[PDB]
Design a protein around this ligand. Structure first.
Ligand SMILES: CC(=O)N[C@H]1[C@H](O[C@H]2[C@@H](O)[C@@H](CO)O[C@H](O[C@@H]3[C@H](O)[C@@H](O)[C@H](O[C@H]4[C@H](O)[C@@H](O)[C@H](O)O[C@@H]4CO)O[C@@H]3CO)[C@@H]2O)O[C@H](CO)[C@H](O)[C@@H]1O
Ligand SMILES: *[C@@H]1O[C@H](CO)[C@@H](O[C@@H]2O[C@H](CO)[C@@H](O)[C@H](O)[C@H]2NC(C)=O)[C@H](O)[C@H]1NC(C)=O
Ligand SMILES: O=c1ccn([C@@H]2O[C@H](COP(=O)(O)OP(=O)(O)O)[C@@H](O)[C@H]2O)c(=O)[nH]1
Ligand SMILES: *[C@@H]1O[C@H](CO[C@@H]2O[C@@H](C)[C@@H](O)[C@@H](O)[C@@H]2O)[C@@H](O)[C@H](O)[C@H]1NC(C)=O
Ligand SMILES: OC[C@H]1O[C@@H](O)[C@H](O)[C@@H](O)[C@H]1O
Ligand SMILES: [Mn+2]
Length: 267
């Protein structure tokens, strides 16, 4: 479907249990390298395969274009299509990832769309998913159930009435990190063209899920996704799935902390 870059992976041969799709700008190489050394490292988690890919569009900068071309050649984990990669095109970026799952990895049991300024505890996520007994039409994350369109003209999430004309948004999950069973990717790509467009990608996916009659559900009896960020501790971070507001160096320091304290017990 018009992909400029496709990861060197074969999901039919080796169906992944969890596929991470990470959004990042071309200049955010430091982010991607920190993820590649930390929670993005492909591995078997409780015998389940984890795969990690980075979603990119295109840019006017020839330098960044060449950098990203070289990165794809060294890492082979970039999914790319020809759309201008800017904040207000994040919906295209998300739909590219969903399209990739639909076309090339329908075998994925679960797919997590995540941001680059994030800590992800794949071990705990896998444990909770294996416990949920939900393999189809499943969608979870930080649930946002009574959200009102931001009508402040200079806010990053401002939508005019012509862009979104209704008083409330549909149920949706924060775009920081959301997880869905792999079949969900095909149903969304299908109805995508008939659902009203909105430039906020997490609201757009919510509109698609609503059209599909897919209901959001909490992953666990306790909160596990933290779009607002968290005060760090080893024992807390062992029992969460996702935390936002995390810069590259902090992610390496947190990952080192968890490695250093492996084998220590927590209340
Ligand atoms: C991370 C996330 O979920 N982003 C979504 C954004 O979620 C925000 C939304 O729910 C609002 C509505 O009450 O609450 C939180 O945001 C607060 C403010 O409403 C929001 O404007 C502000 O954002 C910036 C603010 O405009 C500036 O004045 C300030 O200087 O900087 C703020 C940060 O950049 O943030 C506060 C607390 O974060 C939620 O975070 O909602 C949109 C839809 O409107 C979309 O779903 C995003 O995914
Ligand atoms: C999102 O990406 C699309 C595709 O790259 C942009 O649309 C193109 O915009 C360029 C100028 O930036 C035009 O020359 C093309 O004719 C457009 N093509 C298509 C197919 O749309 C779009 O401008 C980007 N959105 C934002 C907000 O930057
Ligand atoms: O052109 C852009 C701008 C942003 N992002 C990604 O979009 C996510 C959210 O952007 P940011 O963290 O700046 O904003 P937030 O929504 O957290 O306030 C991050 O993964 C960014 O790397 C992207 O892929 N391309
Ligand atoms: C998930 O399932 C676990 C295993 O239970 C067995 O399989 C499930 C699918 C049911 O058929 C159940 O009756 C069987 O005993 C349960 O231990 C666990 O509680 C389940 N978790 C949830 C979310 O209920
Ligand atoms: O495009 C909307 C964006 O706003 C919110 C979230 O932080 C991002 O991941 C994305 O959902
Ligand atoms: Mn962010």
């Amino acid at each position: 479907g018009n992909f400029l870059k496709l990861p060197d992976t074969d999901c039919r041969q080796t169906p992944p249990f969890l596929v991470l799709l990470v959004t990042s700008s071309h200049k955010q190489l430091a982010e991607r390298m920190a993820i590649r050394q930390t929670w993005g490292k492909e591995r078997m988690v409780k015998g389940k395969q984890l795969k990690t890919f980075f979603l990119l569009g295109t840019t006017s900068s020839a330098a960044e274009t060449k950098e990203v071309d070289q990165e794809s050649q060294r890492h082979g984990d970039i999914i790319q299509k020809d759309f201008l990669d800017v904040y207000y095109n994040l919906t295209l970026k998300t739909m590219m990832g969903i399209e990739w799952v639909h076309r090339f990895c329908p075998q994925a049991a679960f797919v997590m769309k995540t941001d680059s300024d994030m800590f992800i505890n794949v071990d705990y996520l896998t444990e909770l998913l294996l416990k949920k007994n939900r393999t189809t039409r499943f969608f979870t994350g930080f649930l946002k159930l009574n959200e009102f369109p931001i009508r402040q003209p200079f806010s990053k999430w401002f939508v005019s009435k012509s862009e979104y004309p209704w008083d409330r948004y549909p149920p949706f999950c924060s775009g920081t990190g959301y997880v869905f069973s792999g079949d969900v990717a095909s149903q969304v790509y299908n109805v995508s063209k008939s659902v009203p467009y909105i430039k906020l990608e997490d609201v757009f996916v919510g509109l698609c899920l609503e059209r599909l009659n897919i209901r959001l559900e909490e992953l666990h009896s306790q909160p596990t996704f933290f779009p607002g960020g968290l005060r760090f501790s080893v024992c807390l971070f062992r029992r969460i799935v996702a935390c936002h507001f995390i810069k590259p160096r902090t992610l390496l320091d947190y990952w080192q902390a968890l490695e250093n304290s492996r084998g220590e017990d927590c209340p």
